[PDB]
């Protein structure tokens, strides 16, 4: 099953949470150059937990892609109004998958991009997130159905280590279904380098 080409980015089947993020109307897509990337494993709905990071990226002068369980209510509303006013170049999408796998893929993305997942179970506060926790990529492209992360800035050794972790998980898998879902994570990681 050789792939006769180089990587084409890490792509997952989640699209923009608002059409007002679209900055490339020709292709109905959001294209962000050198974006910061926020990874959170919970639903973001309060403006309170969104402003700190927003002011941070606004200060650095960089676009931001937010990947969380979901982004809605006042939080989403604040992202939309500020993006339309041109104060920040943001886009929000739901994290891929569900359950434990959703969490594992959020970590795949964090590792690929040099970011840190803002994890609810361990007590991490979104309002306490800093630029250091944000991941980065050369570019991201989001349309109605997908999100593509191009050239994540993660440490090469860390990314290779994550692939090795998944490889071991595959050997320990008990079904072709599980093995293919694990292999899917490997292919996505390989696509983002």
Swiss-Prot record:
The known PTMs are summarized as: Phosphorylated reversibly during heat shock.
Q: Where in the cell is it found?
A: Cytoplasm
Q: Which residues are annotated with the PTM N6-succinyllysine?
A: 94, 138
Function summary: Together with its co-chaperonin GroES, plays an essential role in assisting protein folding. The GroEL-GroES system forms a nano-cage that allows encapsulation of the non-native substrate proteins and provides a physical environment optimized to promote and accelerate protein folding, probably by preventing aggregation and by entropically destabilizing folding intermediates. Also plays a role in coupling between replication of the F plasmid and cell division of the cell.
So what family is this one in? Belongs to the chaperonin (HSP60) family.
Oligomeric form and interacting partners: Forms a cylinder of 14 subunits composed of two heptameric rings stacked back-to-back. Interacts with the co-chaperonin GroES. Can form asymmetrical complexes, composed of one GroEL and one GroES, and symmetrical complexes, formed between one GroEL and two GroES oligomers. The asymmetrical complex is the functional unit. It was suggested that the symmetric heterooligomer may represent a transient intermediate in the chaperonin protein folding cycle.
Q: What is known of its domains?
A: Each subunit is composed of an apical domain that binds non-folded proteins and GroES, an intermediate domain and an equatorial domain that binds ATP and is involved in inter-ring interactions. Forms a large central channel that appears to traverse the entire length of the cylinder with no obstruction. The central channel of GroEL functions as two cavities, one in each ring, that are separated from each other by the crystallographically disordered 23-amino-acid C-terminal segments of the seven subunits. The entry and exit of polypeptide seem to be restricted to the apical end of each ring. Modulating the volume of the GroEL central cavity affects folding speed in accordance with confinement theory. Small proteins fold more rapidly as the size of the cage is gradually reduced to a point where restriction in space slows folding dramatically. For larger proteins, either expanding or reducing cage volume decelerate folding. A stepwise reduction in cage size results in a gradual loss of cell viability.
Q: What is this protein called?
A: Chaperonin GroEL
- Organism whose genome encodes this protein: Escherichia coli (strain K12)
Q: Which residues of the full protein are shown?
A: 191 to 376 of 548
């Amino acid at each position: 099953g050789l792939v006769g080409r180089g990587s084409e980015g890490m792509q997952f089947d989640r699209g923009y949470l608002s059409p007002y993020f679209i900055n490339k109307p020709e292709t109905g897509a959001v294209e962000l150059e050198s974006p910061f990337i926020l990874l959170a494993d919970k639903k973001i709905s309060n403006i309170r937990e969104m402003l700190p990071v927003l002011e941070a990226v606004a200060k650095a002068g960089k676009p931001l892609l937010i990947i969380a369980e979901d982004v809605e209510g006042e939080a989403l509303a604040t992202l939309v109004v500020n993006t339309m006013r041109g104060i920040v170049k943001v886009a929000a999408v739901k994290a891929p998958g569900f359950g434990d796998r959703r969490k594992a893929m959020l970590q795949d993305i964090a590792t690929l991009t040099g970011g840190t997942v803002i994890s609810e179970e361990i007590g991490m506060e979104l309002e306490k997130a800093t630029l250091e926790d944000l991941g980065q990529a050369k570019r991201v492209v989001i349309n109605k159905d997908t999100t593509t992360i191009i050239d994540g800035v993660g440490e090469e050794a860390a990314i290779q280590g994550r692939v090795a972790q998944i490889r071991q998980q595959i050997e320990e898998a008990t079904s072709d279904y599980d093995r293919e879902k694990l292999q899917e994570r490997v292919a996505k990681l390989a696509g983002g380098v």
